[PDB]
């Protein structure tokens, strides 16, 4: 039986019952996060595994936002130097264009 300093009692025949908080000759010392969490390092109840799940989901959001925006950016990259001052034979288009080619394909 696991006991995280809660209290578990066992009754054995004609003898006094013993309840224990899992007392030993060791102690803690300012453990646990200020906002409620579980005993020892161990993941269960998930409150150490919740930070893993959250962080993993966060990375995917950076990729989804980057890619979708980028696409819109490539159409402006064509537009701006064309309209600016054509832009039909100049090397100027190329610097902006390299980005735009990578975005569209």
């Amino acid at each position: 039986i696991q006991v995280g300093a809660e209290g578990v009692e066992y009754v054995w025949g004609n003898n006094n019952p013993v309840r224990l908080w899992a007392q030993k000759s060791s102690s803690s010392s300012a453990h646990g996060n200020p906002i409620s969490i579980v005993s020892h390092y161990y993941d269960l109840y998930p409150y150490w595994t919740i930070t893993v799940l959250a962080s993993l989901g966060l990375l995917i959001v950076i990729s989804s936002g980057f890619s979708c925006f980028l696409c819109s950016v490539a159409r402006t990259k064509c537009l701006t130097p064309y309209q600016l001052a054509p832009g039909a034979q100049l090397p100027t288009f190329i610097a902006l264009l390299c980005c735009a080619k990578s975005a569209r394909a």
Binding site: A22, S29, W48
Partner: protein, 425 residues
Amino acid sequence: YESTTMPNQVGIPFKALIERPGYAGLPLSLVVIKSELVPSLVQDYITCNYKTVVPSPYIKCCGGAECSKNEADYKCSVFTGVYPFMWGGAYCFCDTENSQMSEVYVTRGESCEADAIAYQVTASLKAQVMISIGELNQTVDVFVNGDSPARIQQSKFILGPISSAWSPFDKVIVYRDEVYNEDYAPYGSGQAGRFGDIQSRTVNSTDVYANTNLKLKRPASGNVVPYTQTPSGFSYWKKEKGVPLNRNAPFGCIIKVNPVRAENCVYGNIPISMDIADAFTRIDESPSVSLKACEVQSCTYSSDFGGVASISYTSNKVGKCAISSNSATMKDSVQDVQESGALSLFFATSSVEPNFVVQVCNARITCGKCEPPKDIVPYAAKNDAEFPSISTTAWQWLATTSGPLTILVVAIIVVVVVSIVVCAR
């Protein structure tokens, strides 16, 4: 001056400081030894094992007869044409109209002087608080419902009402063997298919509701009466029992049979108020302390209530201040500090403090350390909430924060740049 609201947890010293600005007074330490659920109950019934008593046949020769009467509960049937003899075996010369008065009634055993009494309980609440003014140590029964003044050592205490307090008892039956939480319906049990067949109004009753059935018949044999007998269900049901009241409790409660109580139920909060007879001749002592530090030792990942750490500081002010703390718990509370170095103290860790704001007088820091992630690798266990707290891992997970910013700089530039193009040409 007055007023803290401390939680009920046994054996753990709560530190309340709430006195006038400048601390030089008496630090209040208060312990709950036990809580004492003192009943204000209604006795539903007494039940016990029972002895049904059937007198041996009384016959009266020839003719009819009639029966009467009550002894506690009674059934009576007069059989007729009893026996077949006519030679002193009927004990009569008749056997065609000869009559037998048979009778049965209920009496109570000798278990009834003992178990068991059925109570509807609603307990009223008494506390057995321990007052430590750092000069004497004494405990006191006091009811904690109502506004309830007492003065001890000539310090006023006013015990405020206790609410949000667990009740194990509801429908309960108290046996002498062990209390059991059992439901029933009083004065409506009988026969032998149930436990608590006899239902009795008082402990020394003369009226009993039982439906117990035992069937006499007329003698018609050379023996002496035919009987079919269902005997008492109570003795059978005695093994089977209910389920214990004792194990019933989410936290605490050891249910004691004889007075009827539950000791040590850690639930309910006691708001407290005090005039400790402040002034005194305050302020005239007040230590101050410099170079405040925390060392962490005895960090093991076993769940115990202990706590073994040290704090380093230096003092040069000779006094006793009222110490310590209102978001932390020390086991000390009186320390004449004249000079100081490393001072090892005991703490109530993983009890009701998982966080500590450590004070030594008017002065303070927040502590402490020991909370590694899941490898394990030590880290601090303070300050920001990130759930292994401030860690190289916690920072490394946090570093997603740059991702939303890079995708935002790209959007700002593109929106402003279009508007600028149209204008440009």
